[PDB]
Design a protein around this ligand. Structure first.
Ligand SMILES: CC(=O)N1CCc2c(NS(=O)(=O)c3cccc(Cl)c3O)cccc21
Length: 358
Protein backbone atom coordinates (compact mmCIF):
# COMPACT_ATOMS: atom_id res chain seq x y z
CA UNK A 1 0.00 0.00 0.00
CA UNK A 2 2.02 2.96 -1.31
CA UNK A 3 1.62 5.94 0.99
CA UNK A 4 0.20 8.11 -1.80
CA UNK A 5 -2.63 5.63 -2.39
CA UNK A 6 -3.17 5.21 1.36
CA UNK A 7 -3.44 8.97 1.92
CA UNK A 8 -5.75 9.94 -0.95
CA UNK A 9 -8.12 7.05 -0.22
CA UNK A 10 -8.40 7.62 3.53
CA UNK A 11 -8.62 11.40 3.27
CA UNK A 12 -11.45 11.13 0.74
CA UNK A 13 -13.45 8.21 2.12
CA UNK A 14 -13.35 8.95 5.86
CA UNK A 15 -15.25 12.27 5.49
CA UNK A 16 -17.62 10.66 2.98
CA UNK A 17 -18.56 7.95 5.49
CA UNK A 18 -19.11 10.60 8.17
CA UNK A 19 -21.11 12.97 5.96
CA UNK A 20 -23.33 10.24 4.49
CA UNK A 21 -23.53 8.20 7.73
CA UNK A 22 -22.52 5.05 5.86
CA UNK A 23 -22.37 2.06 8.25
CA UNK A 24 -19.69 0.10 6.38
CA UNK A 25 -17.63 0.47 3.23
CA UNK A 26 -15.04 -1.38 1.17
CA UNK A 27 -12.82 0.26 -1.46
CA UNK A 28 -10.40 -1.20 -4.01
CA UNK A 29 -7.96 0.90 -6.02
CA UNK A 30 -6.37 -0.69 -9.08
CA UNK A 31 -3.12 1.18 -9.70
CA UNK A 32 -0.82 0.18 -12.58
CA UNK A 33 -2.81 -3.06 -12.68
CA UNK A 34 -2.40 -4.08 -9.01
CA UNK A 35 -5.18 -4.00 -6.37
CA UNK A 36 -5.11 -2.26 -2.99
CA UNK A 37 -7.91 -2.77 -0.47
CA UNK A 38 -9.46 -0.62 2.26
CA UNK A 39 -12.33 -1.30 4.67
CA UNK A 40 -14.29 0.70 7.26
CA UNK A 41 -17.15 0.15 9.65
CA UNK A 42 -19.84 -2.49 9.98
CA UNK A 43 -21.33 -5.18 7.76
CA UNK A 44 -23.85 -5.90 10.56
CA UNK A 45 -24.42 -3.12 13.10
CA UNK A 46 -26.43 -5.22 15.56
CA UNK A 47 -24.00 -8.16 15.56
CA UNK A 48 -20.93 -5.85 15.49
CA UNK A 49 -19.51 -7.62 12.40
CA UNK A 50 -16.87 -5.52 10.61
CA UNK A 51 -16.48 -5.00 6.88
CA UNK A 52 -13.66 -7.23 5.64
CA UNK A 53 -12.18 -8.05 2.24
CA UNK A 54 -14.53 -11.07 2.24
CA UNK A 55 -17.77 -9.16 3.00
CA UNK A 56 -20.49 -9.58 0.37
CA UNK A 57 -22.29 -6.44 -0.85
CA UNK A 58 -25.35 -6.08 -3.07
CA UNK A 59 -24.11 -4.54 -6.33
CA UNK A 60 -27.50 -3.38 -7.51
CA UNK A 61 -27.31 -2.09 -11.07
CA UNK A 62 -23.56 -2.74 -11.31
CA UNK A 63 -24.89 -6.27 -12.00
CA UNK A 64 -25.85 -4.93 -15.43
CA UNK A 65 -22.14 -4.89 -16.35
CA UNK A 66 -22.06 -8.66 -15.80
CA UNK A 67 -25.22 -9.04 -17.90
CA UNK A 68 -23.71 -6.90 -20.67
CA UNK A 69 -20.53 -9.00 -20.76
CA UNK A 70 -22.41 -12.32 -20.67
CA UNK A 71 -24.47 -11.07 -23.60
CA UNK A 72 -21.30 -10.06 -25.41
CA UNK A 73 -19.95 -13.55 -24.84
CA UNK A 74 -23.09 -15.06 -26.37
CA UNK A 75 -22.66 -12.78 -29.39
CA UNK A 76 -19.01 -13.82 -29.72
CA UNK A 77 -20.03 -17.50 -29.53
CA UNK A 78 -22.45 -16.95 -32.43
CA UNK A 79 -25.49 -17.82 -30.31
CA UNK A 80 -27.18 -14.38 -30.73
CA UNK A 81 -26.78 -11.17 -32.72
CA UNK A 82 -27.64 -7.70 -31.43
CA UNK A 83 -29.32 -7.06 -34.80
CA UNK A 84 -31.70 -9.99 -34.13
CA UNK A 85 -35.38 -9.10 -33.58
CA UNK A 86 -36.56 -9.75 -30.05
CA UNK A 87 -39.21 -12.11 -31.42
CA UNK A 88 -36.55 -14.46 -32.79
CA UNK A 89 -35.86 -15.59 -29.21
CA UNK A 90 -39.42 -15.08 -27.89
CA UNK A 91 -41.86 -16.00 -30.68
CA UNK A 92 -44.82 -15.78 -28.27
CA UNK A 93 -44.18 -12.00 -28.25
CA UNK A 94 -46.63 -11.42 -31.09
CA UNK A 95 -47.93 -7.91 -30.33
CA UNK A 96 -47.25 -5.56 -33.24
CA UNK A 97 -45.31 -2.95 -31.27
CA UNK A 98 -42.39 -5.41 -31.09
CA UNK A 99 -41.76 -5.30 -34.85
CA UNK A 100 -38.44 -3.51 -35.20
CA UNK A 101 -37.28 -3.91 -31.59
CA UNK A 102 -33.90 -5.71 -31.59
CA UNK A 103 -31.75 -7.20 -28.84
CA UNK A 104 -29.56 -4.10 -29.20
CA UNK A 105 -32.51 -1.89 -28.22
CA UNK A 106 -33.21 -4.00 -25.13
CA UNK A 107 -29.56 -4.01 -24.08
CA UNK A 108 -29.18 -0.22 -24.38
CA UNK A 109 -32.55 1.10 -23.03
CA UNK A 110 -33.61 2.31 -26.50
CA UNK A 111 -36.64 0.08 -27.26
CA UNK A 112 -39.09 2.99 -26.95
CA UNK A 113 -39.72 3.52 -23.26
CA UNK A 114 -39.75 0.20 -21.44
CA UNK A 115 -40.35 1.09 -17.75
CA UNK A 116 -37.67 1.35 -15.08
CA UNK A 117 -39.24 -1.36 -12.91
CA UNK A 118 -40.97 -4.64 -13.60
CA UNK A 119 -44.22 -4.44 -11.59
CA UNK A 120 -44.27 -6.43 -8.36
CA UNK A 121 -47.35 -8.26 -9.64
CA UNK A 122 -45.22 -9.85 -12.38
CA UNK A 123 -43.76 -13.16 -11.21
CA UNK A 124 -44.24 -16.11 -13.58
CA UNK A 125 -43.06 -16.68 -17.13
CA UNK A 126 -46.67 -16.14 -18.23
CA UNK A 127 -47.00 -12.92 -16.18
CA UNK A 128 -43.84 -11.64 -17.85
CA UNK A 129 -45.12 -12.43 -21.36
CA UNK A 130 -48.37 -10.62 -20.57
CA UNK A 131 -46.50 -7.57 -19.26
CA UNK A 132 -44.34 -7.21 -22.37
CA UNK A 133 -47.30 -7.88 -24.68
CA UNK A 134 -49.37 -5.11 -23.11
CA UNK A 135 -46.56 -2.54 -22.92
CA UNK A 136 -47.18 0.45 -25.18
CA UNK A 137 -44.04 2.24 -26.42
CA UNK A 138 -44.04 6.00 -26.27
CA UNK A 139 -41.38 6.27 -28.98
CA UNK A 140 -40.07 4.52 -32.06
CA UNK A 141 -37.17 2.15 -31.34
CA UNK A 142 -33.71 3.64 -31.39
CA UNK A 143 -34.71 7.26 -30.74
CA UNK A 144 -34.65 7.88 -26.96
CA UNK A 145 -32.89 6.31 -23.97
CA UNK A 146 -34.80 5.56 -20.75
CA UNK A 147 -32.81 3.59 -18.16
CA UNK A 148 -34.82 0.47 -17.38
CA UNK A 149 -34.52 -2.86 -15.56
CA UNK A 150 -37.27 -4.27 -17.77
CA UNK A 151 -35.12 -3.54 -20.85
CA UNK A 152 -31.68 -4.93 -20.05
CA UNK A 153 -33.29 -7.58 -17.85
CA UNK A 154 -35.14 -9.02 -20.84
CA UNK A 155 -31.95 -8.81 -22.92
CA UNK A 156 -30.16 -10.98 -20.36
CA UNK A 157 -32.97 -13.53 -20.24
CA UNK A 158 -33.15 -13.83 -24.03
CA UNK A 159 -29.39 -13.80 -24.56
CA UNK A 160 -28.94 -17.10 -22.73
CA UNK A 161 -31.82 -18.96 -24.40
CA UNK A 162 -29.80 -20.57 -27.27
CA UNK A 163 -27.29 -21.89 -24.71
CA UNK A 164 -29.93 -23.99 -22.94
CA UNK A 165 -28.52 -22.85 -19.60
CA UNK A 166 -30.40 -20.92 -16.96
CA UNK A 167 -29.19 -17.33 -16.65
CA UNK A 168 -27.46 -18.09 -13.35
CA UNK A 169 -25.75 -21.21 -14.72
CA UNK A 170 -24.56 -19.36 -17.82
CA UNK A 171 -23.18 -16.50 -15.71
CA UNK A 172 -21.35 -18.96 -13.44
CA UNK A 173 -19.90 -21.12 -16.20
CA UNK A 174 -19.10 -18.42 -18.74
CA UNK A 175 -18.10 -15.38 -16.65
CA UNK A 176 -17.57 -16.00 -12.92
CA UNK A 177 -15.58 -19.25 -13.16
CA UNK A 178 -13.20 -18.27 -16.02
CA UNK A 179 -12.36 -15.00 -14.20
CA UNK A 180 -11.88 -16.73 -10.80
CA UNK A 181 -14.75 -14.74 -9.27
CA UNK A 182 -15.29 -17.42 -6.66
CA UNK A 183 -17.13 -15.25 -4.13
CA UNK A 184 -19.62 -13.66 -6.53
CA UNK A 185 -23.22 -14.89 -6.40
CA UNK A 186 -26.64 -14.35 -7.88
CA UNK A 187 -28.02 -16.31 -4.91
CA UNK A 188 -25.93 -16.21 -1.75
CA UNK A 189 -25.35 -19.79 -0.55
CA UNK A 190 -25.88 -20.60 3.14
CA UNK A 191 -22.12 -21.21 3.56
CA UNK A 192 -21.47 -17.57 2.70
CA UNK A 193 -24.23 -15.90 4.75
CA UNK A 194 -21.78 -15.12 7.57
CA UNK A 195 -20.16 -12.69 5.11
CA UNK A 196 -23.35 -11.19 3.63
CA UNK A 197 -23.57 -7.59 4.86
CA UNK A 198 -26.91 -6.12 5.79
CA UNK A 199 -28.11 -3.09 3.89
CA UNK A 200 -29.45 -0.14 5.85
CA UNK A 201 -32.47 1.91 4.78
CA UNK A 202 -33.90 4.43 7.27
CA UNK A 203 -31.91 2.63 9.97
CA UNK A 204 -33.48 -0.78 9.23
CA UNK A 205 -31.40 -3.78 8.16
CA UNK A 206 -32.60 -4.96 4.74
CA UNK A 207 -31.70 -7.32 1.89
CA UNK A 208 -32.93 -7.04 -1.69
CA UNK A 209 -36.30 -8.76 -2.22
CA UNK A 210 -36.95 -11.27 -5.03
CA UNK A 211 -38.40 -9.93 -8.26
CA UNK A 212 -38.93 -10.75 -11.89
CA UNK A 213 -35.68 -10.46 -13.88
CA UNK A 214 -33.81 -9.59 -10.65
CA UNK A 215 -30.81 -11.79 -11.48
CA UNK A 216 -30.41 -10.08 -14.88
CA UNK A 217 -30.87 -6.45 -13.77
CA UNK A 218 -29.71 -6.07 -10.17
CA UNK A 219 -29.05 -9.43 -8.60
CA UNK A 220 -25.29 -9.92 -8.13
CA UNK A 221 -23.54 -9.87 -4.74
CA UNK A 222 -19.74 -9.75 -4.50
CA UNK A 223 -16.68 -9.01 -2.35
CA UNK A 224 -14.24 -6.15 -2.82
CA UNK A 225 -11.58 -8.65 -3.93
CA UNK A 226 -13.76 -10.14 -6.65
CA UNK A 227 -14.81 -6.68 -7.81
CA UNK A 228 -11.18 -5.61 -8.13
CA UNK A 229 -10.64 -8.70 -10.31
CA UNK A 230 -13.70 -7.69 -12.34
CA UNK A 231 -12.12 -4.25 -12.90
CA UNK A 232 -8.76 -5.82 -13.84
CA UNK A 233 -10.53 -8.06 -16.37
CA UNK A 234 -12.33 -5.10 -17.93
CA UNK A 235 -9.14 -3.00 -17.97
CA UNK A 236 -7.18 -5.64 -19.94
CA UNK A 237 -9.55 -8.03 -21.74
CA UNK A 238 -6.75 -9.37 -23.97
CA UNK A 239 -5.06 -11.02 -20.98
CA UNK A 240 -8.15 -13.24 -20.71
CA UNK A 241 -7.48 -16.62 -22.31
CA UNK A 242 -11.09 -17.60 -23.03
CA UNK A 243 -11.57 -16.18 -26.51
CA UNK A 244 -15.30 -15.44 -26.54
CA UNK A 245 -15.14 -13.89 -23.06
CA UNK A 246 -12.31 -11.61 -24.17
CA UNK A 247 -14.45 -10.49 -27.11
CA UNK A 248 -17.58 -10.17 -24.97
CA UNK A 249 -15.83 -7.72 -22.64
CA UNK A 250 -14.69 -5.72 -25.66
CA UNK A 251 -18.26 -5.66 -27.03
CA UNK A 252 -19.70 -4.38 -23.75
CA UNK A 253 -17.33 -1.38 -23.87
CA UNK A 254 -18.26 -0.48 -27.46
CA UNK A 255 -20.10 2.84 -27.96
CA UNK A 256 -23.58 2.24 -29.39
CA UNK A 257 -25.42 5.52 -28.64
CA UNK A 258 -24.49 9.03 -27.58
CA UNK A 259 -26.46 11.32 -25.27
CA UNK A 260 -24.63 14.50 -24.35
CA UNK A 261 -21.11 13.55 -23.31
CA UNK A 262 -22.07 9.96 -22.42
CA UNK A 263 -21.83 6.82 -24.57
CA UNK A 264 -23.95 3.73 -23.88
CA UNK A 265 -22.29 0.30 -23.85
CA UNK A 266 -23.72 -3.05 -22.83
CA UNK A 267 -24.14 -2.35 -19.13
CA UNK A 268 -21.10 -0.09 -18.98
CA UNK A 269 -21.44 3.63 -19.70
CA UNK A 270 -18.50 5.64 -21.03
CA UNK A 271 -17.14 9.15 -21.47
CA UNK A 272 -14.06 10.39 -23.29
CA UNK A 273 -11.04 10.66 -21.00
CA UNK A 274 -10.02 13.21 -19.68
CA UNK A 275 -13.49 13.87 -18.21
CA UNK A 276 -14.79 17.04 -16.71
CA UNK A 277 -15.96 15.85 -13.25
CA UNK A 278 -19.16 17.91 -13.46
CA UNK A 279 -20.07 16.03 -16.65
CA UNK A 280 -20.06 12.76 -14.68
CA UNK A 281 -20.97 14.10 -11.22
CA UNK A 282 -24.16 15.78 -12.45
CA UNK A 283 -24.39 13.35 -15.39
CA UNK A 284 -25.22 10.31 -13.24
CA UNK A 285 -27.35 12.07 -10.57
CA UNK A 286 -30.24 9.84 -9.45
CA UNK A 287 -32.28 12.61 -7.87
CA UNK A 288 -34.23 12.13 -11.12
CA UNK A 289 -36.59 9.13 -11.06
CA UNK A 290 -37.13 9.10 -14.86
CA UNK A 291 -34.83 10.85 -17.37
CA UNK A 292 -35.82 10.49 -21.03
CA UNK A 293 -33.04 11.57 -23.39
CA UNK A 294 -32.76 11.62 -27.20
CA UNK A 295 -29.95 9.41 -28.50
CA UNK A 296 -27.73 9.61 -31.56
CA UNK A 297 -26.85 6.26 -33.11
CA UNK A 298 -23.14 5.55 -33.45
CA UNK A 299 -23.12 3.91 -36.88
CA UNK A 300 -21.29 1.56 -36.66
CA UNK A 301 -20.50 1.31 -32.92
CA UNK A 302 -17.04 2.46 -31.89
CA UNK A 303 -14.88 -0.41 -30.56
CA UNK A 304 -13.75 -0.07 -26.95
CA UNK A 305 -11.83 3.20 -26.62
CA UNK A 306 -8.91 2.86 -24.20
CA UNK A 307 -9.02 6.63 -23.57
CA UNK A 308 -12.34 6.44 -21.70
CA UNK A 309 -13.83 6.84 -18.26
CA UNK A 310 -15.88 3.61 -18.03
CA UNK A 311 -18.27 3.44 -15.10
CA UNK A 312 -21.51 2.23 -13.55
CA UNK A 313 -23.47 3.20 -10.45
CA UNK A 314 -25.66 0.71 -8.64
CA UNK A 315 -28.16 0.68 -5.82
CA UNK A 316 -30.56 -1.50 -3.93
CA UNK A 317 -32.80 -0.41 -1.09
CA UNK A 318 -29.94 -0.74 1.36
CA UNK A 319 -26.76 -0.60 -0.74
CA UNK A 320 -24.84 1.82 -2.93
CA UNK A 321 -22.05 0.79 -5.30
CA UNK A 322 -19.79 2.44 -7.86
CA UNK A 323 -17.16 1.21 -10.32
CA UNK A 324 -15.00 3.37 -12.59
CA UNK A 325 -11.83 2.64 -14.54
CA UNK A 326 -9.58 4.20 -17.19
CA UNK A 327 -8.09 1.57 -19.55
CA UNK A 328 -5.32 3.79 -20.94
CA UNK A 329 -4.03 4.49 -17.40
CA UNK A 330 -4.42 0.92 -15.99
CA UNK A 331 -6.36 2.71 -13.24
CA UNK A 332 -9.65 1.94 -11.50
CA UNK A 333 -11.72 2.03 -8.34
CA UNK A 334 -14.55 0.06 -6.70
CA UNK A 335 -16.67 1.54 -3.91
CA UNK A 336 -19.09 -0.77 -2.05
CA UNK A 337 -21.32 0.58 0.73
CA UNK A 338 -24.25 -0.77 2.73
CA UNK A 339 -26.27 2.42 2.43
CA UNK A 340 -27.83 3.84 -0.75
CA UNK A 341 -26.31 7.35 -0.65
CA UNK A 342 -26.37 10.02 -3.41
CA UNK A 343 -24.66 9.21 -6.71
CA UNK A 344 -22.93 12.64 -7.01
CA UNK A 345 -21.05 11.93 -3.77
CA UNK A 346 -19.86 8.57 -5.14
CA UNK A 347 -18.59 10.05 -8.41
CA UNK A 348 -16.96 13.02 -6.65
CA UNK A 349 -15.02 10.72 -4.30
CA UNK A 350 -13.99 8.39 -7.14
CA UNK A 351 -12.80 11.32 -9.26
CA UNK A 352 -10.81 12.85 -6.39
CA UNK A 353 -8.98 9.53 -5.94
CA UNK A 354 -8.34 8.62 -9.58
CA UNK A 355 -7.41 12.18 -10.57
CA UNK A 356 -4.85 12.27 -7.76
CA UNK A 357 -3.26 9.04 -9.02
CA UNK A 358 -3.25 9.57 -12.81
C1 LIG B 1 -34.98 2.51 -2.73
C2 LIG B 1 -35.03 1.10 -3.31
O1 LIG B 1 -35.75 0.28 -2.82
N1 LIG B 1 -34.19 0.76 -4.47
C3 LIG B 1 -33.26 1.68 -5.12
C4 LIG B 1 -32.60 0.91 -6.24
C5 LIG B 1 -33.17 -0.50 -6.18
C6 LIG B 1 -32.90 -1.62 -6.99
N2 LIG B 1 -31.90 -1.49 -8.06
S1 LIG B 1 -32.33 -0.86 -9.60
O2 LIG B 1 -33.79 -0.90 -9.78
O3 LIG B 1 -31.87 -1.80 -10.63
C7 LIG B 1 -31.68 0.83 -9.94
C8 LIG B 1 -32.61 1.77 -10.39
C9 LIG B 1 -32.21 3.07 -10.68
C10 LIG B 1 -30.89 3.44 -10.52
C11 LIG B 1 -29.95 2.51 -10.08
CL1 LIG B 1 -28.25 3.04 -9.89
C12 LIG B 1 -30.33 1.20 -9.78
O4 LIG B 1 -29.35 0.29 -9.32
C13 LIG B 1 -33.55 -2.83 -6.76
C14 LIG B 1 -34.49 -2.92 -5.73
C15 LIG B 1 -34.77 -1.81 -4.93
C16 LIG B 1 -34.10 -0.58 -5.15
Amino acid sequence: APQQINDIVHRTITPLIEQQKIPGMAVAVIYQGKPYYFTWGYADIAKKQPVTQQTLFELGSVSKTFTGVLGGDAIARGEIKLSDPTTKYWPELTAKQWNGITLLHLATYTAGGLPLQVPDEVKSSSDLLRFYQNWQPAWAPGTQRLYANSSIGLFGALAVKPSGLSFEQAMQTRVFQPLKLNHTWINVPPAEEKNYAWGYREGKAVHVSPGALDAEAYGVKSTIEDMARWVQSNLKPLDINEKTLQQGIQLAQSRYWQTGDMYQGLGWEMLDWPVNPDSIINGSDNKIALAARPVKAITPPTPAVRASWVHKTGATGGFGSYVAFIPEKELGIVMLANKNYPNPARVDAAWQILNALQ
